[PDB]
Swiss-Prot record, chain B:
Protein localization: Host cytoplasm; Host Golgi apparatus; Host nucleus
Gene name in the database record: rep
Source organism: Severe acute respiratory syndrome coronavirus 2 (2019-nCoV)
Resulting phenotype, residue 46 to A: Does not affect ability to cleave and inactivate human TRMT1
Cytoplasmic topology ranges: 1-297
Subunit structure: 3CL-PRO exists as monomer and homodimer. Only the homodimer shows catalytic activity. Interacts with host FBXO22; this interaction promotes the proteasomal degradation of nsp5.
Residues of the full protein shown: 3267 to 3563 of 7096
Entry function: Cleaves the C-terminus of replicase polyprotein at 11 sites. Recognizes substrates containing the core sequence [ILMVF]-Q-|-[SGACN]. Cleaves and inactivates human TRMT1, preventing tRNA guanine(26)-dimethylation of tRNAs. May cleave human NLRP1 in lung epithelial cells, thereby activating the NLRP1 inflammasome pathway. May cleave human GSDMD, triggering alternative GSDME-mediated epithelial cell death upon activation of the NLRP1 inflammasome, which may enhance the release interleukins 1B, 6, 16 and 18. Also able to bind an ADP-ribose-1''-phosphate (ADRP).
Effect of residue 142 to A: Complete loss of 3C-like proteinase nsp5 cleavage
Cross-link Glycyl lysine isopeptide (Lys-Gly) (interchain with G-Cter in ubiquitin) residue location(s): 2, 87
Name of the featured protein: 3C-like proteinase nsp5
Length: 300, 297
């Protein structure tokens, strides 16, 4: 299995740069609106303790430099929605794809198009951790880079990048500007909660192992969902939700292994360890492949 | 993090190519479509295909090329080694600036995996020392290409042709010459003994340091030759002075002499990771080049 990103072209066609003063970051140009992090209006000194509403009242449309490459897009309106700026421009992006704004759940994966000065640098797959951080590769000027999934023809944007935490991980918002997790866009010390293992993805990985004929860990027991959740939490694994049980439905049907039987198999791996064996060539259980990612790669 | 080049410039070049009951992908640059020649085979032909003889018996109209909902008319066809070149009457407006390159083992590239001429995913691969690649390719992925982007220029280096019994993959450059001792015939083929790309393991240990992780370092040092003796023992490629040079900037940046990192890698090989992990992995990663790590740092 590989970490496999979505093709990025449909998103590349939407990246622009947004500058205020000498503060430059990236924006997302969809139809006649550009979306970007609101701290573009901050001087580096204002980031320490910004009053965004006051900062914004001092701004006019003509204080915003929006460029696709080096071609300026005239700003004709601006508003602030949570932690994102919406800049109305006078040109509809002819490369706008079919798109959606979605708020993802911890455990879900997405591709990130890392951009600098409105130019794509690279694409990679990230998982949203249960503590609402992502382990990204973001440098200065990467803010406004977005994360997304592609379903059929439709780009679902789920992430816009805003900041790095002391520990090196990254935090950001959905495309309505609501942070994932207990973070704020202020240049202050913030800590993410202790992280946990993404149980639904580990289960997906076990199903993947079975599909490929590696199935020594299947046992003859089952569990209730509640009993499993209480045990898993003792090993710093996330509890399963009803939605998690549902999204494993296709892999369960493909293999004929009921979700709760697989949970019972995982519980035994947690309680007794691997006893020296490997699964898919690894002694570690992988938690950054969703049930969709497994399907994607095993038949796409 | 394992980071691929943005794939947009390549997506605008992928088409579907069909001959008979066989469909795979082609690469449309200017007025030419490049694709694997085994698209002209049938099940029978699979096993010992005499390609020049199968090709002379095809007409331009035996090739159905589709770019989206639009059929492109084939006005001419020739074969260069294991790739078919289909001339079409329409030029691709989305053709990027591009070059064809043949890469060295240990170099990396991005793959755009396609099916029916439509992009499915993008990921980073390295040309293994035994000239396989550890890809994610299914039925219908042939004609998918690998590439690097420098400036606005796409350097195509790989076109996909086959899977081996071990699950790894083989293919050609865009001149149609295989990497490695493989042949486009439907048979089970083994590769040479794979070895680990040592300069890339070292680049990736420097990456772990640059990200605050240094549990594997040590006070020891080694000579180049003494390190290479140990490397070879564990089926690692030897490290050349040019590799050492190439590693300079990462050495300077971290203040860790190349040969000190070699001494760290030696310790890891002889003792193992003893449970610990590096940049998230229980195994030494060898598919980041020094340039890869640098660009991302
Ligand atoms: C995009 O503008 C930029 C991207 C950062 C820079 C390097 N890596 C990233 O992900 N975002 C910022 O600079 C943030 C702006 C504020 C208004 C949210 N600030 C930020 O991420 O600070 C990084 C800190 C600096 C310092 C203080 C506390 C924790 C660490 C040390 C990291
Ligand atoms: C593209 O047409 C296709 C891509 C393959 C299929 C599955 N994964 C891939 O990467 N290429 C082919 O099918 C090859 C065509 C020949 C003419 C070169 N053949 C091929 O890849 O065969 C796979 C071998 C043989 C077969 C039988 C035993 C072991 C495996 C299945 C490996
Ligand atoms: Cl003809």
């Amino acid at each position: 299995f590989r970490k496999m990103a979505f093709p990025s072209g449909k998103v590349e066609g939407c990246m622009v740069q947004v500058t205020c003063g000498t503060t430059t970051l990236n924006g997302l140009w969809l139809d006649d609106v550009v979306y970007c992090p609101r701290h573009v209006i901050c001087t580096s000194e204002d980031m320490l303790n910004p009053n965004y509403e006051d900062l914004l009242i001092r701004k006019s449309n003509h204080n915003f430099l929006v460029q696709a490459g080096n071609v300026q897009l005239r700003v004709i309106g601006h508003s602030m929605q949570n932690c994102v700026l919406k800049l109305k421009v006078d040109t509809a992006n002819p490369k706008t794809p079919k798109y959606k704004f979605v708020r993802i759940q911890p455990g879900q994966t997405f591709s990130v198009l890392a951009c600098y000065n409105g130019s794509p640098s690279g694409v990679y797959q990230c998982a949203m951790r249960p503590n609402f951080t992502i382990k990204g590769s973001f440098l200065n000027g990467s803010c406004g880079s977005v994360g997304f999934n592609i379903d059929y023809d439709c780009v679902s944007f789920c992430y816009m990048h805003h900041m790095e935490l002391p520990t090196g991980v990254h935090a950001g918002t959905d495309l309505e500007g609501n942070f994932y997790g207990p973070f704020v866009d202020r240049q202050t010390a913030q800590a993410a909660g202790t992280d946990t293992t993404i149980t639904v993805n580990v289960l997906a990985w076990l199903y993947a192992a079975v599909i490929n004929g590696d199935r020594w860990f299947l046992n003859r027991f089952t569990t209730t969902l509640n009993d499993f959740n209480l045990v898993a939490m003792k090993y710093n694994y996330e509890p399963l939700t009803q939605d998690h049980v549902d999204i494993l439905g296709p892999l369960s049907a493909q293999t004929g292994i009921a979700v709760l039987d697989m949970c019972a198999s995982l519980k035994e791996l947690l309680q007794n360890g691997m006893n020296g064996r490997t699964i898919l060539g690894s002694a570690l259980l992988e938690d950054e492949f969703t049930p969709f990612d497994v399907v994607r790669q095993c038949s796409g």
